[PDB]
Symmetry: C3
Subunit: 148 residues, 3 copies
Amino acid sequence: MDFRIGQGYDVHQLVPGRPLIIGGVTIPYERGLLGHSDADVLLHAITDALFGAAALGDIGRHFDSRALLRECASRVAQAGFAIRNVDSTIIAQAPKLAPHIDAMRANIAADLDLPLDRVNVKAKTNEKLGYLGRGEGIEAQAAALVVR
Amino acid sequence: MDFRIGQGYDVHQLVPGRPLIIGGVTIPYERGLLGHSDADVLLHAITDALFGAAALGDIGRHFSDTDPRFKGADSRALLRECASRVAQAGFAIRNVDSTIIAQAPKLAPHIDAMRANIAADLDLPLDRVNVKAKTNEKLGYLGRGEGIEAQAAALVVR
Amino acid sequence: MDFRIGQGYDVHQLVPGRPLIIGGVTIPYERGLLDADVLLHAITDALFGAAALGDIGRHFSDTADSRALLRECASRVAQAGFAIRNVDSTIIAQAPKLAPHIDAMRANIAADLDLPLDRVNVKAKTNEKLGYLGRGEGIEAQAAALVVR
Ligand SMILES: CCOC(=O)c1sc2nccn2c1C
Ligand SMILES: CCOC(=O)c1sc2nccn2c1C
Ligand SMILES: CCOC(=O)c1sc2nccn2c1C
Ligand SMILES: [Cl-]
Ligand SMILES: [K+]
Ligand SMILES: [Zn+2]
Ligand SMILES: [Zn+2]
Ligand SMILES: [Zn+2]
């Protein structure tokens, strides 16, 4: 049928005195992500991928990050699209994200009204390269498939 | 239902004395993108996603950067030729999505025009083409405005 | 029907002293990746991602070369109920020239995934002398995969 794909990218600086919140999960860490919102880099990337797949523009032209993700899903449905799946990658040199992946997936699935088997989150370091490798920021990438 | 996906990446240095042309739009700006062609980073990314979805290789294979015939080339002409070869290979384009990442200038005012150019070149309606603009949150060579990056995704069907 | 998309990313440092293996192909160069097959890793991640099976680190704990890992990945994706429809990818390396080796990489990947050659694509890019990629300090790979349940 009328399938569409979307792709999303986000990055935020890591700064002192902020909670680290990724995929809705508060992760123990001495620094957190800097932004106007709670700076949830993963949710932002997914949001952009979903807007992209529905050809609805981007997060900047539309607008915590879970409320924003829920609103994104609403606007995607309003345009006549159903979400089929989401995949994503977080790139962070530190801290370890593996123990938190399942909770992120559950959060995203709940926000998008999707079963768990249609949401994926993957974790990577940057092999100590560049600003990500120096722990100056955290990047997220996302892909979304929808159908009209 | 023989769907295929493709993805594209491009980056170019931002330098004085070149036109800034992104998504086919000439943007008023003191610097422009450096390349053999008009260096349209967004159109190149989309071109690569389309060739990739059709398993036809990449922009270098089809349009050589060492070939003088492409010096200052209009990247919309390249995108249209790509679309023609994708069609010849038996594929129809279903949608395109993309991201441009730049510290400056502001791209929001130009996005609709880029979308319209890409839609024209691909013979798509506007509602199957998307362009997203952002900054790199001050990080890295993108944060320092040394270059501009584009990412693209395309869905086709044979 | 029940299509899903997946995406993958990988990067490795590029220094003298190790061989350069990308897409199962050994490429002569003064530097190598710290088998560190960046392209196969990205594709593996995209496949696990499309199947919503997590990632390469969850399946294959560092606690076998990258082609063996790719083959096992494909087996798990199949058992989870998914057929692979296509793979596309990009390698970003300032040097050496990767174009001569593309068909060899595609052949290795198609073999490992039991796919027709025309459903596997690999693209090559430089980083226009920008960043650690542009300075030849590492090589990046990006991948996209489409599957169907
Ligand atoms: C205002 C809250 O949402 C937004 O518009 C967002 S989310 C986001 N991530 C990097 C920049 N950015 C902006 C401007
Ligand atoms: C010259 C038109 O097509 C090409 O070959 C292109 S487009 C392009 N963008 C960055 C490098 N590059 C090359 C080598
Ligand atoms: C055992 C092979 O799989 C892995 O865990 C991999 S693949 C890989 N590429 C960069 C880091 N990295 C790790 C930790
Ligand atoms: Cl920036
Ligand atoms: K990148
Ligand atoms: Zn953000
Ligand atoms: Zn280019
Ligand atoms: Zn790797």
